[PDB]
Write a protein that binds this ligand. Structure first.
Ligand SMILES: CC(C)CCC[C@@H](C)CCC[C@@H](C)CCC[C@@H](C)CCOC[C@@H](CO)OCC[C@H](C)CCC[C@H](C)CCC[C@H](C)CCCC(C)C
Ligand SMILES: CC(C)CCC[C@@H](C)CCC[C@@H](C)CCC[C@@H](C)CCOC[C@@H](CO)OCC[C@H](C)CCC[C@H](C)CCC[C@H](C)CCCC(C)C
Ligand SMILES: CC(C)CCC[C@@H](C)CCC[C@@H](C)CCC[C@@H](C)CCOC[C@@H](CO)OCC[C@H](C)CCC[C@H](C)CCC[C@H](C)CCCC(C)C
Ligand SMILES: CC(C)CCC[C@@H](C)CCC[C@@H](C)CCC[C@@H](C)CCOC[C@@H](CO)OCC[C@H](C)CCC[C@H](C)CCC[C@H](C)CCCC(C)C
Ligand SMILES: CC(C)CCC[C@@H](C)CCC[C@@H](C)CCC[C@@H](C)CCOC[C@@H](CO)OCC[C@H](C)CCC[C@H](C)CCC[C@H](C)CCCC(C)C
Ligand SMILES: CC(C)CCC[C@@H](C)CCC[C@@H](C)CCC[C@@H](C)CCOC[C@@H](CO)OCC[C@H](C)CCC[C@H](C)CCC[C@H](C)CCCC(C)C
Ligand SMILES: *C/C=C(C)/C=C/C=C(C)/C=C/C1=C(C)CCCC1(C)C
Ligand SMILES: *C/C=C(C)/C=C/C=C(C)/C=C/C1=C(C)CCCC1(C)C
Ligand SMILES: *C/C=C(C)/C=C/C=C(C)/C=C/C1=C(C)CCCC1(C)C
Ligand SMILES: CCCCCCCCCCCCCCC
Ligand SMILES: CCCCCCCCCCCCCCC
Ligand SMILES: CCCCCCCCCCCCCCC
Ligand SMILES: CCCCCCCCCCCCCCC
Ligand SMILES: CCCCCCCCCCCCCCC
Ligand SMILES: CCCCCCCCCCCCCCC
Ligand SMILES: CCCCCCCCCCCCCC
Ligand SMILES: CCCCCCCCCCCCCC
Ligand SMILES: CCCCCCCCCCCCC
Ligand SMILES: CCCCCCCCCCCCC
Ligand SMILES: CCCCCCCCCCCCC
Ligand SMILES: CCCCCCCCCCC
Ligand SMILES: CCCCCCCCCCC
Ligand SMILES: CCCCCCCCCCC
Ligand SMILES: CCCCCCCCCC
Ligand SMILES: CCCCCCCCCC
Ligand SMILES: CCCCCCCCCC
Ligand SMILES: CCCCCCCCC
Ligand SMILES: CCCCCCCCC
Ligand SMILES: CCCCCCCCC
Ligand SMILES: CCCCCCCC
Ligand SMILES: CCCCCCCC
Ligand SMILES: CCCCCCCC
Ligand SMILES: CCCCCCCC
Ligand SMILES: CCCCCCCC
Ligand SMILES: CCCCCCCC
Ligand SMILES: CCCCCCCC
Lengths: 231, 231, 231
């Protein structure tokens, strides 16, 4: 484990995702509202999945070597197995908050799968220049997601209860800022141009992951928007 | 790229799926009917997924070598990753058109997963004679799907609006004819008996894919069956 | 095939899953109740999936070698591909029986995915002591599932029709007893401590699989709880 300088950030990430999972699990014990139960189930699964994948990276299972640039490059593939399941769950939290229609939910989840799937292909591609073709396709899929979150959901939240509109607006802004950083870290990190070393890259993804999952969840599950209007 | 004679058909397929995706995306911009939005989302995702997998084959990522018959045989595995997601989406288009019940939808999607999954196992199997055992199981799963589309959905469409009944009947006939060709191309192509060479096999799958996805989508999204009855 | 002593139990399992699939398929022909169709579709898919994965193990495709303990250990990875899809389908049978809320269904299916996913990682892990870390995480996920089936569903079934309450109680008890045996067989078998040899381990999993899928299905599909109350 300790033979890799980035191990400290993988261990911290593992701990923070595990602690986040347990807090949400305990906090959700005393909840019977069927609407609130939906948000607790979605939001608790997110850091639980991330916990297992951070642990796999810490123990060395989620790491492979990819030859490109005449070098064997360490690629943590477990990140994409994490994101494949956690990013659509996070979008479902937002879509259920605004009572989005089914067709829009399917478009979001499908574009998200394309985003993560093409990012994985780009991470494992051995022809250096082709890695950035996949990065560009994946980034186009992300821009579609961000467009929908702004010019489809925002207008839908305003016609909703005030507390669900204000909570959505906050979580929307958090998501757009944090998610946009991921393609940048990829491009300048060891998967892309190799400007930033792997140990610093790992620290950046850990800060982003914890903020986008645990921080996101703390804002959502403390809001009254997750409960139905009741007397 | 150009070192493979089949590259021209992979490049054409990539272009036609990309163009198809963009047309459906633009055409769906001016749509607010929640029913129509469902069909546009399903139908636009189909060629978008196929685009990415054709590109992976063009660039050489979606290709592996499988030893059988005393030879290293080029097997494009990316086809099955495509079909795993696009064939159930196409069946969902048909099932939603006739307002199929949930139990029937689950049976269709499950049989479809078995069809594609066993076809993938057959494509990667190293014992030559066993490849055709998997082909037979996969073909049995397809025949179940075709039976349901005829002796379960057809009777349901007649009790529906006339425009949804006539549109379903057309898309049903297109699907049964085109899908039935796939097991035949597999059997006589490089995955099976090896009668037809890979470059011709690739041309045939490209014609079938574009027809079953883009051609299918053009018929559906030009129909009024996708809109609810409104004044 | 016959070069492996466990082949006899893989062949028996294949036959019993295939026969089970055909019986459920025939029995479900004469069913039009939309509620009953749901249970028949879920319950017939379970042994059909298991059939294909037992066949892959029989023919040698679903087997790999994992080095640990200074030895190349035969690991049947196809079991986890089976369980990944069949265990959530079995939980869906139970959840639909008691009309569970959506949030609870998602929590069950998500915990089940974590259970199977971490068990697969543990089966393929090359550092011997780490294999049991994954076993423990997977077992914690199972205990969560069992808790929900007892202290969330049981109370919900009592407020239901008497026949659905008594049928659920029976299937609940069958599930908790049979599922609990799996982590024990893993721990003492070739994936874990290696006390029980592989051929005996394979026999035990076959008895458990057939009972948990075909036996489970025979109890459910003979009950009147799967039909709506009708005159
Ligand atoms: C009902 O809706 C509320 C349940 O949602 C919340 C239910 C959760 C979604 C269930 C998923 C958690 C499982 C219990 C998994 C247990 C293993 C975890 C990874 C444990 C990690 C923390 C600890 C080991 C440090
Ligand atoms: C509606 C939305 C959900 C739609 C989703 C969008 C999606 C279509 C976007 C594209 C996804 C696609 C790129 C997934 C590729 C997975 C692949 C990286 C797995 C590893 O295989 C890659 C190479 C080794 O580098 O295999 C070496 C050769 C091996 C012999 C490969 C044989 C196994 C194949 C991988 C079998 C295909 C399985 C499916 C891809 C499983 C789904 C994985 C997940 C990442 C989507
Ligand atoms: C709301 O419902 C309508 C949206 O459906 C339609 C929405 C679509 C389903 C969203 C999926 C498309 C994404 C925007 C993916 C973008 C990358 C594409 C693969 C681009 C391919 C064409 C071009 C690069 C040649
Ligand atoms: C309700 C419906 C959706 C049900 C679906 C029906 C489905 C059950 C039908 C059978 C599907 C099954 C054959 C999928 C097999 C995937 C497999 C080809 C992936 C590549 O692995 C094959 C060998 C190399 O040749 O791995 C070499 C050895 C490696 C060490 C393998 C270890 C990884 C395992 C593959 C882990 C299992 C992952 C799941 C199979 C992922 C789903 C893939 C998709 C193709 C279903
Ligand atoms: C409508 O709801 C009822 C259909 O459910 C029941 C429908 C089933 C869920 C459909 C799935 C079965 C498919 C027909 C697959 C056929 C291949 C099987 C694996 C055959 C195995 C048995 C035989 C080959 C020994
Ligand atoms: C809501 C719920 C459904 C959530 C589900 C819970 C889930 C997150 C729990 C953890 C699942 C995770 C451990 C799955 C790992 C699959 C992995 C074993 C496949 C084989 O790859 C392992 C190594 C060889 O040993 O690959 C060698 C290196 C290769 C180069 C690997 C590159 C391919 C990657 C495997 C791509 C990721 C694909 C996804 C993991 C596909 C889903 C598989 C299924 C088992 C979940
Ligand atoms: C909890 C994890 C989250 C919210 C991860 C989000 C990840 C992304 C938005 C990743 C995007 C990428 C691109 C847009 C292209 C480059 C490759 C990716 C996958 C890093
Ligand atoms: C857009 C792609 C489509 C509609 C693909 C359809 C593919 C099939 C219907 C494939 C069927 C197969 C068999 C029936 C057995 C032989 C292997 C397959 C997977 C080619
Ligand atoms: C039809 C198959 C069924 C119902 C299989 C159930 C399997 C389990 C409940 C497996 C549980 C495991 C653990 C709890 C940890 C050890 C590894 C597993 C996956 C065997
Ligand atoms: C979206 C965030 C990207 C900003 C990356 C900042 C990295 C600064 C760290 C110093 C770079 C290390 C280079 C010298 C080793
Ligand atoms: C009462 C609110 C705080 C509860 C404690 C939460 C502990 C989980 C770890 C959170 C750290 C990361 C927060 C986002 C920066
Ligand atoms: C379902 C369509 C299958 C028909 C295949 C027709 C192939 C004819 C092309 C000529 C065969 C090439 C053999 C000589 C190289
Ligand atoms: C107005 C209808 C035609 C629009 C142009 C569609 C261009 C997408 C490519 C379609 C070619 C394949 C059609 C099926 C044979
Ligand atoms: C949950 C069931 C686990 C019980 C396992 C009993 C196995 C007894 C078979 C004899 C053990 C073989 C050891 C000598 C070869
Ligand atoms: C009339 C009920 C029996 C029908 C025959 C079922 C045959 C399928 C194989 C069942 C054997 C396994 C039963 C569970 C132990
Ligand atoms: C194995 C991959 C299957 C999933 C394909 C994605 C489409 C799923 C459609 C689900 C239809 C709704 C069923 C109720
Ligand atoms: C990782 C594979 C999980 C999918 C298994 C297929 C069954 C899914 C059941 C979904 C139940 C409906 C939830 C609302
Ligand atoms: C185009 C939709 C408007 C909202 C999206 C904001 C774009 C942020 C740019 C992200 C940069 C990634 C490289
Ligand atoms: C048996 C259901 C009737 C409709 C299915 C038509 C069968 C077409 C044969 C396809 C040939 C594939 C080898
Ligand atoms: C803790 C929830 C109560 C019901 C679960 C029964 C636990 C059975 C123990 C299984 C042993 C697996 C190692
Ligand atoms: C080795 C660098 C080659 C540059 C390729 C950049 C491709 C980016 C595509 C974005 C449209
Ligand atoms: C090398 C050819 C061996 C023939 C096997 C055919 C199997 C087909 C099974 C269809 C029932
Ligand atoms: C080689 C045996 C090492 C023992 C590790 C046991 C780990 C079990 C963790 C359960 C909390
Ligand atoms: C609940 C605390 C979980 C912390 C265990 C993971 C941290 C790795 C320490 C080496
Ligand atoms: C929108 C046009 C997309 C065409 C790019 C793919 C074709 C491959 C050319 C080499
Ligand atoms: C319907 C009977 C299915 C039996 C075939 C599988 C058994 C393997 C025999 C070698
Ligand atoms: C993106 C930063 C999240 C901050 C988490 C703190 C929330 C406390 C209510
Ligand atoms: C299967 C052939 C499809 C033909 C596509 C043309 C549709 C234009 C309305
Ligand atoms: C767990 C044992 C199941 C027994 C199956 C027999 C059911 C006949 C109704
Ligand atoms: C009005 C809410 C502002 C939230 C933005 C937070 C950016 C990290
Ligand atoms: C909408 C604000 C985008 C912020 C992008 C930050 C990328 C590091
Ligand atoms: C009555 C519609 C006929 C459609 C069949 C088209 C076959 C390619
Ligand atoms: C229902 C007509 C089937 C046509 C099969 C064509 C196979 C090449
Ligand atoms: C295995 C075939 C079953 C025969 C019919 C059983 C009575 C519905
Ligand atoms: C009251 C029903 C008892 C069922 C338990 C069966 C254990 C195999
Ligand atoms: C609730 C009874 C548990 C039985 C466990 C059996 C494990 C072999």
């Amino acid at each position: 484990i300790t033979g890799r300088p980035e191990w400290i950030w993988l261990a911290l990430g593992t701990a923070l995702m595990g602690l986040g999972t347990l807090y949400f699990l305990v906090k959700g014990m005393g909840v019977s509202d069927p609407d609130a139960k939906k948000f607790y189930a979605i939001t608790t699964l997110v850091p639980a999945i991330a916990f297992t994948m951070y642990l796999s990276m810490l123990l060395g299972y989620g790491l492979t070597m990819v030859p490109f640039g005449g070098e064997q490059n360490p690629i943590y593939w477990a990140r994409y197995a994490d994101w494949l399941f956690t990013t659509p769950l996070l979008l479902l939290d937002l879509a259920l908050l605004v009572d989005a229609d089914q067709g829009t939910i399917l478009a979001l989840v499908g574009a998200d799968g394309i985003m993560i799937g093409t990012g994985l292909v780009g991470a494992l591609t051995k022809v250096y220049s082709y890695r950035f073709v996949w990065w560009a396709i994946s980034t186009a899929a992300m821009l579609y997601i961000l467009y929908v979150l702004f010019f489809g959901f925002t207008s839908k939240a305003e016609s909703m209860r005030p507390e669900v509109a204000s909570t959505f607006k906050v979580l929307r802004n958090v998501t757009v800022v944090l998610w946009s950083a991921y393609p940048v870290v990829w491009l300048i990190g060891s998967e892309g141009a190799g400007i930033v070393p792997l140990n610093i890259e790992t620290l950046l993804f850990m800060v982003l992951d914890v903020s986008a999952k645990v921080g996101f969840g703390l804002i959502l599950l403390r809001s009254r928007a997750i409960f139905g209007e009741a007397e």
